Short mmCIF file of N, CA and C in Angstrom, two decimals:
data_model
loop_
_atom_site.label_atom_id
_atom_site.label_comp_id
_atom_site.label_asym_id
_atom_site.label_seq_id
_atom_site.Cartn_x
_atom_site.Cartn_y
_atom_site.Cartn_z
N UNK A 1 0.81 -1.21 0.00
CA UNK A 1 0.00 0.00 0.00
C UNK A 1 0.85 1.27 0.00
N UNK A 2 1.90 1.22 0.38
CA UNK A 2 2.79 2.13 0.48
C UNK A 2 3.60 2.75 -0.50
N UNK A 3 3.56 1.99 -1.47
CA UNK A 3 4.45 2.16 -2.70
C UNK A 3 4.22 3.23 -3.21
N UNK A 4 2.35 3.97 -3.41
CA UNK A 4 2.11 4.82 -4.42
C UNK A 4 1.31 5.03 -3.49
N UNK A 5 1.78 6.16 -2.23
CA UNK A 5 1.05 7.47 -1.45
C UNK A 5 0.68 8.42 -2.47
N UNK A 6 0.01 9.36 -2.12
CA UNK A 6 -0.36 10.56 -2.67
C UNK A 6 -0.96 11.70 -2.22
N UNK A 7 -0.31 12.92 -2.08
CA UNK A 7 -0.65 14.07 -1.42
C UNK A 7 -1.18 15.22 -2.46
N UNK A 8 -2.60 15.13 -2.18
CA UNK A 8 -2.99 16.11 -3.57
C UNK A 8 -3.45 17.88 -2.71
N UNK A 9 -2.75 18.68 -3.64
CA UNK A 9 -2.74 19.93 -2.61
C UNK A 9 -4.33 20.45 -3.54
N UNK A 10 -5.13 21.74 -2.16
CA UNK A 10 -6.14 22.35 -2.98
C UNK A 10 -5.47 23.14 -4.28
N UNK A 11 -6.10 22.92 -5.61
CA UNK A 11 -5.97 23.92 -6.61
C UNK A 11 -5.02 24.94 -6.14
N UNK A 12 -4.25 25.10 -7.37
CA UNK A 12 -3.27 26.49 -7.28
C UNK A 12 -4.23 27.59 -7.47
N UNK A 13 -3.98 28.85 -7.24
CA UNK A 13 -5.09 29.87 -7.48
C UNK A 13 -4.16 31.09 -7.88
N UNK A 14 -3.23 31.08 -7.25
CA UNK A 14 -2.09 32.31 -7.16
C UNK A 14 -0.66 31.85 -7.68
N UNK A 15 0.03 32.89 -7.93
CA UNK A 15 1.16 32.52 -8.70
C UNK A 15 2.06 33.78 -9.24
N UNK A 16 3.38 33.30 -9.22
CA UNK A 16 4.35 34.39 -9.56
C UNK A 16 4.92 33.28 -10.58
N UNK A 17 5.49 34.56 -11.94
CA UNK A 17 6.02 34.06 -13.14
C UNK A 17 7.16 34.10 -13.09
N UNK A 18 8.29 33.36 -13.06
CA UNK A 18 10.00 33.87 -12.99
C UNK A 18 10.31 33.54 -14.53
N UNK A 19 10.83 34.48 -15.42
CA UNK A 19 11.46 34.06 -16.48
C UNK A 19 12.48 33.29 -17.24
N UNK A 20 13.95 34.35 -16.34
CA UNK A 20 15.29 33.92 -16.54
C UNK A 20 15.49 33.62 -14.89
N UNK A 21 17.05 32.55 -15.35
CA UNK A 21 16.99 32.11 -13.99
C UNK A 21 17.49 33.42 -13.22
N UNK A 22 18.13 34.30 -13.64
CA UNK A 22 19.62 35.35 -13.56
C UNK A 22 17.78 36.46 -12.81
N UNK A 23 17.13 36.41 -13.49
CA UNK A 23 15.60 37.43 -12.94
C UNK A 23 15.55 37.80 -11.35
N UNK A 24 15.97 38.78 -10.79
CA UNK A 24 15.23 39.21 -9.40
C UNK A 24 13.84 39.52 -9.09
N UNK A 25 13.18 39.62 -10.36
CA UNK A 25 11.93 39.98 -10.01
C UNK A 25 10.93 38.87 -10.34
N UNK A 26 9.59 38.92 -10.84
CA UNK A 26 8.73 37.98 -11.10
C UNK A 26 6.98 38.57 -11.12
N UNK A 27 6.12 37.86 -12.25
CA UNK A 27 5.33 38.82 -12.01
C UNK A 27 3.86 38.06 -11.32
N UNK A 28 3.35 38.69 -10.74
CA UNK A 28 2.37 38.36 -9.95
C UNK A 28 1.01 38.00 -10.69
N UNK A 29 0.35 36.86 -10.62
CA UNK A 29 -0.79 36.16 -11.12
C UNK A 29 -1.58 35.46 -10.29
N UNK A 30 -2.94 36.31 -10.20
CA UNK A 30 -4.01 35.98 -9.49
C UNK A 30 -5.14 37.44 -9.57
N UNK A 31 -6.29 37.34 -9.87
CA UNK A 31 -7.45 38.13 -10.15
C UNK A 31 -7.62 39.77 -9.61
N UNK A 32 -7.52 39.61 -8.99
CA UNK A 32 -7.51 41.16 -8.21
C UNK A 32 -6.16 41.59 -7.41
N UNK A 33 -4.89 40.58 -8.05
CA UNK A 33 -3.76 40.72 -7.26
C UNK A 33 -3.43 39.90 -6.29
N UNK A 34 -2.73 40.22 -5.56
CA UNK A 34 -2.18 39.22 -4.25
C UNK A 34 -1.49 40.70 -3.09
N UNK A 35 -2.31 39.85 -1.87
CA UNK A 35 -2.21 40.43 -0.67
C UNK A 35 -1.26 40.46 0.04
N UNK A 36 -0.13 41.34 0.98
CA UNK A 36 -0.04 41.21 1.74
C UNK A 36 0.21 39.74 2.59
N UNK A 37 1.19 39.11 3.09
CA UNK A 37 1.17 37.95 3.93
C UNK A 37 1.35 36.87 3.11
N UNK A 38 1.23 36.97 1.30
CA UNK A 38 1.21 35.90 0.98
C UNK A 38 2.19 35.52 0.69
N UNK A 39 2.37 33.79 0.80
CA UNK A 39 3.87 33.25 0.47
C UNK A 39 3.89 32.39 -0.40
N UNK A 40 5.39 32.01 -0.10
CA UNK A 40 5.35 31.25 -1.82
C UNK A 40 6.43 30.21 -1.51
N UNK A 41 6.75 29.20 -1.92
CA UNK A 41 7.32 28.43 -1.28
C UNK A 41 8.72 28.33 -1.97
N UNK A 42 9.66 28.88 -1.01
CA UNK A 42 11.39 29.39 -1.38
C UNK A 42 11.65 30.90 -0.51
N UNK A 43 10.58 30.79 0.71
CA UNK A 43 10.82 31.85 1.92
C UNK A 43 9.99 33.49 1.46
N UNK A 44 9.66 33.67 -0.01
CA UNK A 44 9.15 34.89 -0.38
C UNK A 44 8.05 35.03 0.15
N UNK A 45 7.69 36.28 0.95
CA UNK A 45 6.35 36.37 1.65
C UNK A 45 6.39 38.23 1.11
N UNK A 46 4.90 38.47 0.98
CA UNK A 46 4.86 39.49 0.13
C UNK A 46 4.76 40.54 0.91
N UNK A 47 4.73 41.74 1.14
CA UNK A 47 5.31 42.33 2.26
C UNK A 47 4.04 43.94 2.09
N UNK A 48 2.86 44.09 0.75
CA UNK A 48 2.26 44.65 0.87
C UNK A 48 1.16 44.03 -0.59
N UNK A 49 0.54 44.57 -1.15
CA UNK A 49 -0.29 44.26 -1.93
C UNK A 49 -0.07 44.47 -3.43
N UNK A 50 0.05 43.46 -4.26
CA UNK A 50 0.96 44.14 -5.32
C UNK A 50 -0.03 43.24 -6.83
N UNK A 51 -0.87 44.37 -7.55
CA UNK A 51 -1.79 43.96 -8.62
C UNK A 51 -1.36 42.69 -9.33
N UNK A 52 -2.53 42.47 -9.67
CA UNK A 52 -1.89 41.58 -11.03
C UNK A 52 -1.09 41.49 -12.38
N UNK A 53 -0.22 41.06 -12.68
CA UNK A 53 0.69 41.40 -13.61
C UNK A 53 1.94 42.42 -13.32
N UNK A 54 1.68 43.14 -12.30
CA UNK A 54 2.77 43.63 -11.57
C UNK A 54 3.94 42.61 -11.12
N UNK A 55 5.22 43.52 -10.68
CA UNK A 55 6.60 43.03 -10.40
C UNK A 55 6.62 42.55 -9.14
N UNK A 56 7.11 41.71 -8.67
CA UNK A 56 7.49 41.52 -7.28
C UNK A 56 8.76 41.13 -7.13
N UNK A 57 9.54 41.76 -5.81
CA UNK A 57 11.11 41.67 -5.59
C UNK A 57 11.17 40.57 -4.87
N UNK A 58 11.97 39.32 -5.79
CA UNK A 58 12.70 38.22 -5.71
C UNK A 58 12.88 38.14 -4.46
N UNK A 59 14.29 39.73 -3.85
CA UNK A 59 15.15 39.37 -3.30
C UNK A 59 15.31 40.75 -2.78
N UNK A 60 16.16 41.02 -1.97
CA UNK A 60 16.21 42.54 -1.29
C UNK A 60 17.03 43.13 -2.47
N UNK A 61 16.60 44.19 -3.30
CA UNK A 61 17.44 45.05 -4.15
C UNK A 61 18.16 46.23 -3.72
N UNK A 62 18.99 46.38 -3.50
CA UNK A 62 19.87 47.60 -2.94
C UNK A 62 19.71 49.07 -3.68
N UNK A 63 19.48 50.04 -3.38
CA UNK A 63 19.75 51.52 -3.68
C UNK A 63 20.43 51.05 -4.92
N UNK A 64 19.94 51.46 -5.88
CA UNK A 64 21.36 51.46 -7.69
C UNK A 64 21.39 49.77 -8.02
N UNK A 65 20.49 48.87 -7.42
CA UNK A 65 21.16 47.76 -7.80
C UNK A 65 19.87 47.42 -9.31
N UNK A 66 21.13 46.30 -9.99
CA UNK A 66 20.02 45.98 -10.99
C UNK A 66 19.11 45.12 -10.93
N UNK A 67 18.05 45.69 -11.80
CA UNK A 67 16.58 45.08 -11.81
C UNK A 67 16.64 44.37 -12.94
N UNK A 68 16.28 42.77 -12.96
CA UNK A 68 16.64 41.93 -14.08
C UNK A 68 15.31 41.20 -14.45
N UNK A 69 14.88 41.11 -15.54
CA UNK A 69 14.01 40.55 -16.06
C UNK A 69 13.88 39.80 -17.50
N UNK A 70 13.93 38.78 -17.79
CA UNK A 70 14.16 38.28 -18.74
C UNK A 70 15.58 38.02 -19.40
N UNK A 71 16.13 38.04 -17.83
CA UNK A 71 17.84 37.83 -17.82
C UNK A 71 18.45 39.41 -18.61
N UNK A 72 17.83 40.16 -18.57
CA UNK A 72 18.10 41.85 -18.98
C UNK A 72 18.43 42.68 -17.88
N UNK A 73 19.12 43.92 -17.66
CA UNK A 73 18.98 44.45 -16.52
C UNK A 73 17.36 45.24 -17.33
N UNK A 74 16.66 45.61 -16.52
CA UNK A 74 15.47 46.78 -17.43
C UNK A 74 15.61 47.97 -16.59
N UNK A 75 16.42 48.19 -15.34
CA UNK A 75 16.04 49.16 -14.58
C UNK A 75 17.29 49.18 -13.50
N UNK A 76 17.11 50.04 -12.36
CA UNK A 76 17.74 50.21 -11.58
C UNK A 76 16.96 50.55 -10.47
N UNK A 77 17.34 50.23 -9.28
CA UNK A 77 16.11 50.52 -8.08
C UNK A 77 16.79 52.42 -7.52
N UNK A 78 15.57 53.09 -7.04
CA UNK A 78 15.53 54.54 -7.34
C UNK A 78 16.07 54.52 -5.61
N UNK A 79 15.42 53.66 -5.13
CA UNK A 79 15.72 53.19 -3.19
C UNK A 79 16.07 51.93 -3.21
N UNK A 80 15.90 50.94 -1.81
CA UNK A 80 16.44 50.13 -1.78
C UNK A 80 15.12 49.41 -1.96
N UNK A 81 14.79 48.07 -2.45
CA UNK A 81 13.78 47.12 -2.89
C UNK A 81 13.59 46.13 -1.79
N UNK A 82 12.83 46.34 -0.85
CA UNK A 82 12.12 44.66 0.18
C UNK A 82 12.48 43.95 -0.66
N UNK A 83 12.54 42.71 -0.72
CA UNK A 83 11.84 41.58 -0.96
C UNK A 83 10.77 41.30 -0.81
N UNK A 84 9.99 40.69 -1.42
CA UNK A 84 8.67 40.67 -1.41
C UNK A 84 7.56 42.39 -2.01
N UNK A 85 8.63 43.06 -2.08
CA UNK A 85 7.65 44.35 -2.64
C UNK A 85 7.16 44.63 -3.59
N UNK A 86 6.51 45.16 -4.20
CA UNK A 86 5.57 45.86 -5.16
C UNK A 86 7.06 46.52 -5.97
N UNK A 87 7.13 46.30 -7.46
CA UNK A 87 8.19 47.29 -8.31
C UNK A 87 7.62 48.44 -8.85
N UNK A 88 7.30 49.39 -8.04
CA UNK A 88 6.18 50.23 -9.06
C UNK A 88 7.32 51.26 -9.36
N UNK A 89 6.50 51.74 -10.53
CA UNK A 89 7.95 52.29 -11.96
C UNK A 89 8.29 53.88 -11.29
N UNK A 90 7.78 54.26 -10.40
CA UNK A 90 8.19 55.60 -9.63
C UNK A 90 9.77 55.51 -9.53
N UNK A 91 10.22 54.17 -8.86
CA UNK A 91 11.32 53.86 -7.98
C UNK A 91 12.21 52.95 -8.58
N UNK A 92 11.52 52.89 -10.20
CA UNK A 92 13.02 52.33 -11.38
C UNK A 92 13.65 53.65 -12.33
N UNK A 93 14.90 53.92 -11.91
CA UNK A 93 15.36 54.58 -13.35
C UNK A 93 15.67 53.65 -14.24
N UNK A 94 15.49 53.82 -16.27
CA UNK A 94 15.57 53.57 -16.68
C UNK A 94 17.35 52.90 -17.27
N UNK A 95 17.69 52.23 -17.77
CA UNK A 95 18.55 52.38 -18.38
C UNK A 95 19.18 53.13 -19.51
N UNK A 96 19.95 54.09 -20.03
CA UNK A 96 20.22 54.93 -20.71
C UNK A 96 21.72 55.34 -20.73
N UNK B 1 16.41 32.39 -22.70
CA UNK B 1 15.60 33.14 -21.95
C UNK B 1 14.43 32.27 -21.28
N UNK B 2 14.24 31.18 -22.72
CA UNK B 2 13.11 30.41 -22.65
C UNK B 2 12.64 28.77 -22.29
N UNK B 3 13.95 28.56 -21.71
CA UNK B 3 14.35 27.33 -21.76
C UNK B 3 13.71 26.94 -19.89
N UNK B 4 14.13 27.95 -19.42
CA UNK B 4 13.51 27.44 -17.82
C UNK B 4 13.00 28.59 -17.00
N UNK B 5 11.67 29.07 -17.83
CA UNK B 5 10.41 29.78 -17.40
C UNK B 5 9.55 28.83 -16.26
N UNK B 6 9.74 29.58 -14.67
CA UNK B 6 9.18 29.12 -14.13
C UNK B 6 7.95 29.37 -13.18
N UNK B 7 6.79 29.15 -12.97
CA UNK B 7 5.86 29.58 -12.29
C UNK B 7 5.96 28.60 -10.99
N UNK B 8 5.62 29.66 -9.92
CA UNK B 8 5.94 29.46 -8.67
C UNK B 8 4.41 29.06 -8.07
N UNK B 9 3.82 28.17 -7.06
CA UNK B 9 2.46 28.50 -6.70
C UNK B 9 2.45 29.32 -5.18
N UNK B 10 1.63 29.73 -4.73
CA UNK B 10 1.27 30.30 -3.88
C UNK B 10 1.34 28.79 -2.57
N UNK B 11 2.25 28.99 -1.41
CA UNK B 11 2.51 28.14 -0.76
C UNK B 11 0.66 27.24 -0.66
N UNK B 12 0.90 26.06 -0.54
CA UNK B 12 -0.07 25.22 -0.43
C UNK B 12 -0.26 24.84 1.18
N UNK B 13 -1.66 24.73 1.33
CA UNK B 13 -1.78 24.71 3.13
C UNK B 13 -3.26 23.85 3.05
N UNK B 14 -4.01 23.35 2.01
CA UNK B 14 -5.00 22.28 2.39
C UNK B 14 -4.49 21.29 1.43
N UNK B 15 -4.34 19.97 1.68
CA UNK B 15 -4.50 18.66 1.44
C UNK B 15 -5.26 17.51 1.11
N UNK B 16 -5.35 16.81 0.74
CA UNK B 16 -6.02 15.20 0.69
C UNK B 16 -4.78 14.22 0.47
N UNK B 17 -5.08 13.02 1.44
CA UNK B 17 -4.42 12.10 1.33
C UNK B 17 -4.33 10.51 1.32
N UNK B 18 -4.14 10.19 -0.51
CA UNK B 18 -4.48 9.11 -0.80
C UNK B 18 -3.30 8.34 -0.90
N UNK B 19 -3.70 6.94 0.32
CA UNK B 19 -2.82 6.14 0.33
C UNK B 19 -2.41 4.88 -0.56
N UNK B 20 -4.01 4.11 -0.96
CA UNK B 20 -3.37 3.09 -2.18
C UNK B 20 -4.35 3.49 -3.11
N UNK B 21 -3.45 3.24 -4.30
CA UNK B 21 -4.09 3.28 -5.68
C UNK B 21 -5.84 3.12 -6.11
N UNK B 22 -5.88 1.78 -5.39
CA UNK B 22 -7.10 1.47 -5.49
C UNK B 22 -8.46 2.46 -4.32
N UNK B 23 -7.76 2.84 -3.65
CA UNK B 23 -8.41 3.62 -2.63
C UNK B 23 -9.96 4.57 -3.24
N UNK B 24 -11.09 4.60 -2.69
CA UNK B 24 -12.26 5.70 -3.15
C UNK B 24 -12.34 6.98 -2.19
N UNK B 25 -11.58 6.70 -1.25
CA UNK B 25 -11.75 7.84 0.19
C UNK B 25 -10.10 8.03 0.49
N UNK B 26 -10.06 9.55 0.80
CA UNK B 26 -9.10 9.95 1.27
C UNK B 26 -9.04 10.60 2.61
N UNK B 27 -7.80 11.36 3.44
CA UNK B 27 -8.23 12.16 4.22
C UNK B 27 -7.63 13.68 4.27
N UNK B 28 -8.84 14.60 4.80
CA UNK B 28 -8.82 15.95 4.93
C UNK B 28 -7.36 16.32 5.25
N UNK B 29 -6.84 16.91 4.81
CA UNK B 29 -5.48 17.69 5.93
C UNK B 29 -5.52 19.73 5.54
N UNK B 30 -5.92 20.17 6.79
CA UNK B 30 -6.11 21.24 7.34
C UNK B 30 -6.81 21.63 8.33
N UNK B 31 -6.24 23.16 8.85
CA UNK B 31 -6.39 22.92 10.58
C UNK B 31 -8.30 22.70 11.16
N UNK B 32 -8.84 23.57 10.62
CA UNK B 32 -10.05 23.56 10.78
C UNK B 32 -11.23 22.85 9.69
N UNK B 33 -10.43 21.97 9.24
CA UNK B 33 -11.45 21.40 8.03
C UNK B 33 -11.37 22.09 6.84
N UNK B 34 -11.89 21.40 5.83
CA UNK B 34 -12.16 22.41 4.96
C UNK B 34 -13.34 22.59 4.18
N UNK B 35 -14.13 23.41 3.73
CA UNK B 35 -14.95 24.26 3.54
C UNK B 35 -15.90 23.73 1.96
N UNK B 36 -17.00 23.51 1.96
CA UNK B 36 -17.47 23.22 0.86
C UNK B 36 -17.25 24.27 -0.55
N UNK B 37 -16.77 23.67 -1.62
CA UNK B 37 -16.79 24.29 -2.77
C UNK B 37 -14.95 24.27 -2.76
N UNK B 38 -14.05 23.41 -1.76
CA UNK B 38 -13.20 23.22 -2.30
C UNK B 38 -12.61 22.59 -3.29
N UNK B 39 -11.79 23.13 -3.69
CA UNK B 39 -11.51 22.19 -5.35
C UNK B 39 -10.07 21.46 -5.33
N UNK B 40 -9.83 20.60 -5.72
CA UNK B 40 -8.87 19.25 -6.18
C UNK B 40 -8.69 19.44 -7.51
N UNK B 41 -7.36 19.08 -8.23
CA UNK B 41 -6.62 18.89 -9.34
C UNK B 41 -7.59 17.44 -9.81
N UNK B 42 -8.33 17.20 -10.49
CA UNK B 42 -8.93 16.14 -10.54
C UNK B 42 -10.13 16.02 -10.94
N UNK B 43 -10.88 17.32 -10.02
CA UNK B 43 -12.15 17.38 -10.90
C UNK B 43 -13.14 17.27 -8.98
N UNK B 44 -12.45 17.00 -8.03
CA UNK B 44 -12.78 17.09 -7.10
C UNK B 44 -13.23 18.26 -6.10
N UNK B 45 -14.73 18.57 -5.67
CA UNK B 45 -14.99 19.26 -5.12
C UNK B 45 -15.88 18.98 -3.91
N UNK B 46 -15.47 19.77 -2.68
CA UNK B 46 -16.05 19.10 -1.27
C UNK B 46 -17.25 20.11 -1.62
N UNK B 47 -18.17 19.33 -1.32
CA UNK B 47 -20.34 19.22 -1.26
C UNK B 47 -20.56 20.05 -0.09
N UNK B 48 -19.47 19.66 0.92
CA UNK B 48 -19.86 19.76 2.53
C UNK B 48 -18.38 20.27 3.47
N UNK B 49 -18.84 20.77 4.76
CA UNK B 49 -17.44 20.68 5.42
C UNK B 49 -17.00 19.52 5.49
N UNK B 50 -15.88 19.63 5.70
CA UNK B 50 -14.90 18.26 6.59
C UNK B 50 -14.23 18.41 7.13
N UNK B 51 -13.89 17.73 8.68
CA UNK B 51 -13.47 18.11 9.45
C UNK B 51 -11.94 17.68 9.22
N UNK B 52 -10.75 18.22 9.88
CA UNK B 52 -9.66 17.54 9.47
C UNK B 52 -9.22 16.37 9.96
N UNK B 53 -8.80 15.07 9.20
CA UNK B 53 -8.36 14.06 9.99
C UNK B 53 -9.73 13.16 8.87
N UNK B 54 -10.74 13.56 8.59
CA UNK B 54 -11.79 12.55 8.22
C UNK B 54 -11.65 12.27 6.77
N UNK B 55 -12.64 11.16 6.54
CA UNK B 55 -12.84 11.10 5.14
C UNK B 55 -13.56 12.09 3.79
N UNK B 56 -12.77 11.87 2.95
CA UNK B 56 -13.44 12.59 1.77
C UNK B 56 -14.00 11.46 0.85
N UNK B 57 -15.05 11.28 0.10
CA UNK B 57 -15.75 10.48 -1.04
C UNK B 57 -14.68 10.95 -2.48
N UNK B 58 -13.50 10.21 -2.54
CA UNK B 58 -12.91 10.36 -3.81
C UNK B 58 -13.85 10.33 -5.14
N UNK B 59 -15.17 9.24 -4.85
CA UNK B 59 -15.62 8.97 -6.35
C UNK B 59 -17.26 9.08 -5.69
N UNK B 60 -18.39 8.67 -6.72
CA UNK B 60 -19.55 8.36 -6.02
C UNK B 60 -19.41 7.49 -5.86
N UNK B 61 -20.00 6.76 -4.44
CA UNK B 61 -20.00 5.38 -4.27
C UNK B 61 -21.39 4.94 -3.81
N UNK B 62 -22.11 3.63 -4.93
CA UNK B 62 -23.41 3.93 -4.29
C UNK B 62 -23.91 3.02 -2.82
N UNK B 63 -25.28 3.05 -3.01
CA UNK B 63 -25.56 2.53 -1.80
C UNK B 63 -25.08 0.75 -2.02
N UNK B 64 -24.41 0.64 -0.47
CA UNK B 64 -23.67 -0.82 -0.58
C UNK B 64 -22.28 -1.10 -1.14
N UNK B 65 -22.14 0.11 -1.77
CA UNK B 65 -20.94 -0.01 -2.63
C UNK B 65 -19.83 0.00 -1.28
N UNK B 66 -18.42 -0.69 -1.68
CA UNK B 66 -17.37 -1.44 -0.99
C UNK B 66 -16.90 0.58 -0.69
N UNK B 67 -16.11 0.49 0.09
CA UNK B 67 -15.44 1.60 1.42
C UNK B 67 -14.09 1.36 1.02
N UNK B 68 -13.16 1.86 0.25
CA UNK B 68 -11.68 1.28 0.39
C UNK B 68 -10.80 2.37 0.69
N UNK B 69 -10.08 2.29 1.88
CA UNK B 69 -8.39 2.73 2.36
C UNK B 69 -7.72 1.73 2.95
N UNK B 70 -6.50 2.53 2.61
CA UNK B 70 -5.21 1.36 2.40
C UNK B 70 -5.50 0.28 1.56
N UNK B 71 -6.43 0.06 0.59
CA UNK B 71 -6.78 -0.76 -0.51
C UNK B 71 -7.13 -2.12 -0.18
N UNK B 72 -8.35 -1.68 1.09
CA UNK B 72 -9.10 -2.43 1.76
C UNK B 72 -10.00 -2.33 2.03
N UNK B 73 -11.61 -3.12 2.24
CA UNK B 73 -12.43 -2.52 1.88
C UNK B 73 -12.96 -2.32 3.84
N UNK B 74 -13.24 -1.10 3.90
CA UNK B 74 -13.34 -0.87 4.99
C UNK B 74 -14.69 -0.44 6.16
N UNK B 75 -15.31 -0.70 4.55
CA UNK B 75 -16.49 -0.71 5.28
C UNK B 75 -18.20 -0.57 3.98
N UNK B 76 -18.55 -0.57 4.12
CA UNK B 76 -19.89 -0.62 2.74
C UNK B 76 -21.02 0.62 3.23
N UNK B 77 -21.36 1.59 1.90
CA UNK B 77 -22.19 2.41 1.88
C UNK B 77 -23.56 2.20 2.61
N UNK B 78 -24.37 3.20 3.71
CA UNK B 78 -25.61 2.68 4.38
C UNK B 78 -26.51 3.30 3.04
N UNK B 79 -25.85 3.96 2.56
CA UNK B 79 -26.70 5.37 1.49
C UNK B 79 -25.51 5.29 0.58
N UNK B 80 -26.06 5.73 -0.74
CA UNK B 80 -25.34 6.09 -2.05
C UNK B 80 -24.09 7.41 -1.30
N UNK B 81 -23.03 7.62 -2.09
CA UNK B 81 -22.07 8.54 -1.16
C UNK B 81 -21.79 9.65 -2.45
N UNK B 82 -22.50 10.75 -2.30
CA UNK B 82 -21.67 11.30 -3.00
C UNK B 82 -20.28 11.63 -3.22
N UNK B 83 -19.76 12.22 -4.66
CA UNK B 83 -18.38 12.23 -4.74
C UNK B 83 -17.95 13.63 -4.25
N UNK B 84 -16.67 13.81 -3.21
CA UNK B 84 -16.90 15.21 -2.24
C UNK B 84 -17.57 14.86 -0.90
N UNK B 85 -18.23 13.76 -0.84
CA UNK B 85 -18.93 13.97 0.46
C UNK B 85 -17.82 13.86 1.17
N UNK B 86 -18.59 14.45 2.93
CA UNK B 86 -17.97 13.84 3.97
C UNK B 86 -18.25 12.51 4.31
N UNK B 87 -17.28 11.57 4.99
CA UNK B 87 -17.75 9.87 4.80
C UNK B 87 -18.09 10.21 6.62
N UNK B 88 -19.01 10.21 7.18
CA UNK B 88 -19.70 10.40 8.04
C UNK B 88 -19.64 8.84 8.71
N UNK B 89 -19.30 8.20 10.46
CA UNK B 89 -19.07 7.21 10.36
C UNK B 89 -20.58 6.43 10.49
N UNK B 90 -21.90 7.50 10.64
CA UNK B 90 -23.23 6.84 10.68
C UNK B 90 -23.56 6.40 9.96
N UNK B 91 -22.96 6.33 8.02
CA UNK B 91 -23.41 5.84 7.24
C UNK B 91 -22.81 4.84 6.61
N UNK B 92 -21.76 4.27 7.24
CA UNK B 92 -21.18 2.82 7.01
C UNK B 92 -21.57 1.53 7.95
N UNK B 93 -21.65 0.70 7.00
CA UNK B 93 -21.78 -0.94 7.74
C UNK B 93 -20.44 -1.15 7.87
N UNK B 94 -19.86 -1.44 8.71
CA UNK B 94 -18.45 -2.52 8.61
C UNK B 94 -19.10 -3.81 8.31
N UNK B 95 -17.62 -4.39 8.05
CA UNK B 95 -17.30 -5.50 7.41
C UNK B 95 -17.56 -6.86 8.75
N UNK B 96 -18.13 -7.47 8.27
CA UNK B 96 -18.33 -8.94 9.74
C UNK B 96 -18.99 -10.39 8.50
#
């Protein structure tokens, strides 16, 4: 009986997209966004409320550090980036 | 870029757990039960609460029909069982 256990989890509902592996960020998927408190399994817990299709920080981004997406830098953080935060484009300079 | 695109799920915290293959009932895992209109990868949805620790109706099983965990039959339908139900222990005959 033991051979073939099985642990079936409820439906996924929520979800972050990672592209490249080299990516700090990732983008957030679920209907009206994702809240606050939510986690994800690899320690990321989201640290305020961040829409759908929006960015979320991987990893703590430093003042000037790069913002990578699709194994690209696309940005630079304007402050320093939580982990788990919202990337809203106020607080990326561009590359140029 | 495209070679190892990965989607992350939102940490998982309710369960079912099926032990042999042949099995029709599983059991709940979460703290307070879980809640009718939950959904399973499968096509599975709980009818009713369930408390945690109890049975879930993997399939319909009708009235009389064989009871199997650990891929044994553990007991026979008093009533047809819906699929999702809670397996309630008033509505089984054991086995004699």
């Amino acid at each position: 009986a033991m051979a073939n256990i099985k642990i079936r989890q409820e439906t996924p509902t929520a979800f972050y997209i990672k592209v490249h592996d080299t990516d700090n960020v990732a983008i957030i998927v679920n209907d009206n966004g994702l809240k606050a408190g939510t986690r994800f399994p690899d320690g990321l817990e989201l640290i305020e409320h961040i829409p759908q299709g929006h960015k979320v920080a991987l990893l703590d981004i430093p003042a000037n550090g790069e913002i990578i997406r699709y194994g690209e830098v696309i940005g630079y953080a304007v402050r320093a980036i939580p982990r788990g935060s919202w990337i809203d484009e106020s607080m990326v300079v561009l590359p140029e």
